Amino acid sequence: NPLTHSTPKNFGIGQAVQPKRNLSRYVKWPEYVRVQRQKKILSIRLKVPPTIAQFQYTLDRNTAAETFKLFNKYRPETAAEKKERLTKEAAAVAEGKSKQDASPKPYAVKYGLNHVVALIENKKAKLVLIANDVDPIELVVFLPALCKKMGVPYAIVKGKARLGTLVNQKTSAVAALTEVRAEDEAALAKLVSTIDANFADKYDEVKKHWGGGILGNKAQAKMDKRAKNSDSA
Amino acid sequence: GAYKYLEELQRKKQSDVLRFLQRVRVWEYRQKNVIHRAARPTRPDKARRLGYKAKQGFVIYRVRVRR
Amino acid sequence: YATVSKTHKTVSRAYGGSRCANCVKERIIRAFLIEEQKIVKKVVKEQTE
Amino acid sequence: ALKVRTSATFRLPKTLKLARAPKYASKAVPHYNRLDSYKVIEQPITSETAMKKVEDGNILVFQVSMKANKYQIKKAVKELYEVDVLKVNTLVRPNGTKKAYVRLTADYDALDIANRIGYI
Amino acid sequence: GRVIRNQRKGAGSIFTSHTRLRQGAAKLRTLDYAERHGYIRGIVKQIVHDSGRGAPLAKVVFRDPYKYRLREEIFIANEGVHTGQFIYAGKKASLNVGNVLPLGSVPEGTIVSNVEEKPGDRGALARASGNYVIIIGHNPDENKTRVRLPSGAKKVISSDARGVIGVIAGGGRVDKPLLKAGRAFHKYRLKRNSWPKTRGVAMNPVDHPHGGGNHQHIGKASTISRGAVSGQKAGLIAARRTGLLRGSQKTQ
RNA sequence: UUUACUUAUUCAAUGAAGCGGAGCUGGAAUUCCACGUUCUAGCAUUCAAGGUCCCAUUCGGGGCUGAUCCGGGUU
RNA sequence: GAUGGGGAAGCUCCGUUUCAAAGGCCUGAUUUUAUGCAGGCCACCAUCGAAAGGGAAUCCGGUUAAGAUUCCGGAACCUGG
Ligand SMILES: [K+]
Ligand SMILES: [Mg+2]
Ligand SMILES: [Mg+2]
Ligand SMILES: [Mg+2]
Ligand SMILES: [Mg+2]
Ligand SMILES: [Mg+2]
Ligand SMILES: [Mg+2]
Ligand SMILES: [Mg+2]
Ligand SMILES: [Mg+2]
Ligand SMILES: [Mg+2]
Ligand SMILES: [Mg+2]
Ligand SMILES: [Mg+2]
Ligand SMILES: [Mg+2]
Ligand SMILES: [Mg+2]
Ligand SMILES: [Mg+2]
């Protein structure tokens, strides 16, 4: 106590060279980091035509969790499951004269963009999930309108990576249910009701609404200041 | 599949959606190097039409040329 | 200078073979007087408010 | 994402550098010693001047490999002739070969060594 | 038929500046937080001669606000600045000769030097010996300062542009006759290869527009259009008038 | 034609360090102003001492504050 | 005069720290191995460019047909360890 003293440092201008501070706001980030951040910025600074910016509306957290829980009951065969099915099918058709129907009818989520588009055009899809982050977006921009025209319930959902986990891939960009088990028909109907309430019933209204046009932090503050002064006087 | 829709949509270059995508992507390409590896085709339908297959050994490179 | 002992290159004082004696003395006097004036300025600021 | 990073400079992060684990050898037979004693020491130099150096200066005069340095000359002479070397001086002759004046230590007699290795 | 001398100057082979002996580029401090908000005190360590420059330079040492070290700056010394003088640079610095202040922080009629054309260019205007800029007014809204330049031009600069209070030292330099080709020689030996100058009329037609003729004479008007091309711009380029200047300057 | 907007484009600087918006404190009327350095050619660096909380013990170690918060738009 | 970049149909040109994720050296700890995970210190940059510029340290005597501040004798000095 008597040997230690308070020696406060004067960190004001012209004194006591500044302490190490969090400069993460001022980091000269690599070019790829700057590019991805400013691409995200520019995509909302520009006015986004309504075909895009209908994808900023995604399934809410709870409805998405319910949808993904339902879709997780219809995962496709992994390599091990397919190998086991194939051996139990061969060792059955060889001996018991089965008509290659020694395995039951599979009930699996349908994936692959071309496959799901074909199912939508054939009205076989009972529910379509469209990833919101498909990097070339033209692969899925027509999907909400295609589903709306074919009367197929669709939800724009967060994560091609999540759909990839659904279908045992890294990314999937779509995930469809064409048939569902009887114990899950009611869950599918309720979830389709929620999903149509969020996307398909709103489609005619979101199709005429532009997105983007959002200013940055500083421009927003400047516009708020000038609207407070000029507009409210 | 989706490639027919991609092909028809790619022909509406002066539509609002394609104009927006053009502006954003031209900015991104300009920010990148003059020649740089592209992770995937920007137009998968066009790449398939021109002979690209999504297998190991096929490569896409983006290149900027003065007009 | 790498081949000679420390005694040849220094002087036994606060700045040795860097600053001359008179400059060192001026540094001593300036440091002491300016620190004292800093104390005086601080107390004058505190008693003028 | 939310780390402090008190410097405004971003540096390339340190990543693991795996040592090479080749699937096949690069040469498939290591080369034998390219400069052993037998080609470090080409042959003794037996001019009248060199023989005078052998007689009077305790210095053996050798033609040596143009790639051989003084360490190599010293160790090759030591191995080949079982003598201690006090000093090695070298030059490149005008004919493009290398001549080494190898002064043996006082323990050995260069005339005796030359007699043994066959030039008197 | 030949590339003329003023054309040859642009390639910069023998016409580059002789910069060996120079002390370094004379610049203000980098415009940082301390100067933008308060001030920083430096010390004038040396007032030195710069080769090829009439004005003396002042080496001014500041503390680094973010790292424990000293930063030496090369200012152009204003007249009256002395070694051991404390220089104050920033928005809050006092109106004393040698201090570096934003143009908007000084009153009308202030004499400044090494004035930035834009905030942070570290000094562009009134840098030659004896020259200065005068602050003639402020426009606080859309913050600008109107200033008078050594040439007499009026310029509108950002109020955050900085300048050094006072006049550049070494004034009156051109009042002494050089008196000697050798003195001109030594002057330009440390600047560039622009001396001596051969008159174009003393050349041949191949060498210069003015060359040739059985008498030395220009032959056509020496006033040359602004739109003329390289190899033609010898003489009086885009001259509004010629002849012995009789009348007033500062046209209204 | 004059003018605004900013993200294209353009210019410039920096080791992209303190930008923008709020707030605390004091003064004065929801607003305003202030909000660490100026006799002196010294010195100013060791996650800053101090304060506080935790652990773990004889070495000490860690967090918070000191040094307001928010937006990650380097300016 | 490479690199990063940009230009050029191209041979190549510009530019030399630039619009680049451009780093080895200290060591807490590690010693499943003084290293990877992991405490923490420093960078606005290849390289070439001088036998008259800068620069660690050697002198004397003797010796050959022809070498000598290099050999021999003696006597020193510097650098790295
Ligand atoms: K003529
Ligand atoms: Mg691949
Ligand atoms: Mg030699
Ligand atoms: Mg030059
Ligand atoms: Mg003249
Ligand atoms: Mg003349
Ligand atoms: Mg003539
Ligand atoms: Mg002519
Ligand atoms: Mg003419
Ligand atoms: Mg004539
Ligand atoms: Mg080159
Ligand atoms: Mg060299
Ligand atoms: Mg020399
Ligand atoms: Mg001779
Ligand atoms: Mg000797």
From Swiss-Prot, chain A:
Compartments, as annotated in UniProt: Cytoplasm
The keyword DNA-binding is assigned to this record: no
Biological process annotations from GO: cytoplasmic translation; maturation of LSU-rRNA
Keywords linked to the UniProt accession: Cytoplasm, Ribonucleoprotein, Ribosomal protein
GO MF annotation list: RNA binding; structural constituent of ribosome
One GO cellular component, as annotated: cytosol
UniProt-listed Gene3D superfamilies: 3.30.1330.30
Known function: Component of the ribosome, a large ribonucleoprotein complex responsible for the synthesis of proteins in the cell. The small ribosomal subunit (SSU) binds messenger RNAs (mRNAs) and translates the encoded message by selecting cognate aminoacyl-transfer RNA (tRNA) molecules. The large subunit (LSU) contains the ribosomal catalytic site termed the peptidyl transferase center (PTC), which catalyzes the formation of peptide bonds, thereby polymerizing the amino acids delivered by tRNAs into a polypeptide chain.
Further information: Present with 238000 molecules/cell in log phase SD medium.
Subunit field text: Component of the large ribosomal subunit (LSU). Mature yeast ribosomes consist of a small (40S) and a large (60S) subunit. The 40S small subunit contains 1 molecule of ribosomal RNA (18S rRNA) and 33 different proteins (encoded by 57 genes). The large 60S subunit contains 3 rRNA molecules (25S, 5.8S and 5S rRNA) and 46 different proteins (encoded by 81 genes).
Family (UniProt): Belongs to the eukaryotic ribosomal protein eL8 family.
Protein name: Large ribosomal subunit protein eL8A
Curated annotation (Swiss-Prot), chain B:
GO biological process entries: cytoplasmic translation
GO MF annotation list: RNA binding; structural constituent of ribosome
Compartments, record wording: Cytoplasm
Task performed by this protein: Component of the ribosome, a large ribonucleoprotein complex responsible for the synthesis of proteins in the cell. The small ribosomal subunit (SSU) binds messenger RNAs (mRNAs) and translates the encoded message by selecting cognate aminoacyl-transfer RNA (tRNA) molecules. The large subunit (LSU) contains the ribosomal catalytic site termed the peptidyl transferase center (PTC), which catalyzes the formation of peptide bonds, thereby polymerizing the amino acids delivered by tRNAs into a polypeptide chain.
Family: Belongs to the eukaryotic ribosomal protein eL15 family.
Protein name per Swiss-Prot or TrEMBL: Large ribosomal subunit protein eL15A
Miscellaneous section: There are 2 genes for eL15 in yeast.
One term under GO cellular component: cytosol
Keyword Iron-sulfur on entry: no
Subunit structure: Component of the large ribosomal subunit (LSU). Mature yeast ribosomes consist of a small (40S) and a large (60S) subunit. The 40S small subunit contains 1 molecule of ribosomal RNA (18S rRNA) and 33 different proteins (encoded by 57 genes). The large 60S subunit contains 3 rRNA molecules (25S, 5.8S and 5S rRNA) and 46 different proteins (encoded by 81 genes).
Entire protein: shown range: 2 to 68 of 204
Keyword annotations of the record: Cytoplasm, Ribonucleoprotein, Ribosomal protein
Primary location: cytoplasm
From Swiss-Prot, chain C:
A GO cellular-component term linked to this record: cytosolic large ribosomal subunit
Domain of life: Eukaryota
Location in or out of the cell: Cytoplasm
Any Gene Ontology biological process: ribosome biogenesis
Coiled coil: none
GO molecular function, one term: structural constituent of ribosome
Keywords: Cytoplasm, Ribonucleoprotein, Ribosomal protein
Family to which this protein belongs: Belongs to the eukaryotic ribosomal protein eL34 family.
Reported function: Component of the ribosome, a large ribonucleoprotein complex responsible for the synthesis of proteins in the cell. The small ribosomal subunit (SSU) binds messenger RNAs (mRNAs) and translates the encoded message by selecting cognate aminoacyl-transfer RNA (tRNA) molecules. The large subunit (LSU) contains the ribosomal catalytic site termed the peptidyl transferase center (PTC), which catalyzes the formation of peptide bonds, thereby polymerizing the amino acids delivered by tRNAs into a polypeptide chain.
Additional record remark: Present with 23600 molecules/cell in log phase SD medium.
Oligomer and partners: Component of the large ribosomal subunit (LSU). Mature yeast ribosomes consist of a small (40S) and a large (60S) subunit. The 40S small subunit contains 1 molecule of ribosomal RNA (18S rRNA) and 33 different proteins (encoded by 57 genes). The large 60S subunit contains 3 rRNA molecules (25S, 5.8S and 5S rRNA) and 46 different proteins (encoded by 81 genes).
UniProt-recorded name of the protein: Large ribosomal subunit protein eL34A
Taxonomic lineage: Eukaryota, Fungi, Dikarya, Ascomycota, Saccharomycotina
Gene from which this protein is expressed: RPL34A
UniProtKB/Swiss-Prot annotation, chain E:
Record localization: Cytoplasm
One function term, GO molecular function aspect: RNA binding
A Pfam entry, by short name: Ribosomal_L2
Keyword Cytoplasm annotated: yes
Highest taxon of source: Eukaryota
UniProt-listed GO biological process terms: cytoplasmic translation; maintenance of translational fidelity; ribosomal large subunit biogenesis
Signal peptide: none
Keywords associated with the record: Cytoplasm, Isopeptide bond, Phosphoprotein, Ribonucleoprotein, Ribosomal protein, RNA-binding, rRNA-binding, Ubl conjugation
Glycyl lysine isopeptide (Lys-Gly) (interchain with G-Cter in ubiquitin) crosslink site(s): 45, 92, 118, 144
Residue numbers of Phosphoserine PTMs: 51, 94, 158-159, 248
UniProt xrefs under SMART domains: Ribosomal_L2, Ribosomal_L2_C
Disulfide bonds: none
More about this protein: There are 2 genes for uL2 in yeast.
Similarity comment text for this entry: Belongs to the universal ribosomal protein uL2 family.
Quaternary structure (record): Component of the large ribosomal subunit (LSU). Mature yeast ribosomes consist of a small (40S) and a large (60S) subunit. The 40S small subunit contains 1 molecule of ribosomal RNA (18S rRNA) and 33 different proteins (encoded by 57 genes). The large 60S subunit contains 3 rRNA molecules (25S, 5.8S and 5S rRNA) and 46 different proteins (encoded by 81 genes).
Protein name: Large ribosomal subunit protein uL2A
Organism: Saccharomyces cerevisiae (strain ATCC 204508 / S288c) (Baker's yeast)
Name of the coding gene: RPL2A
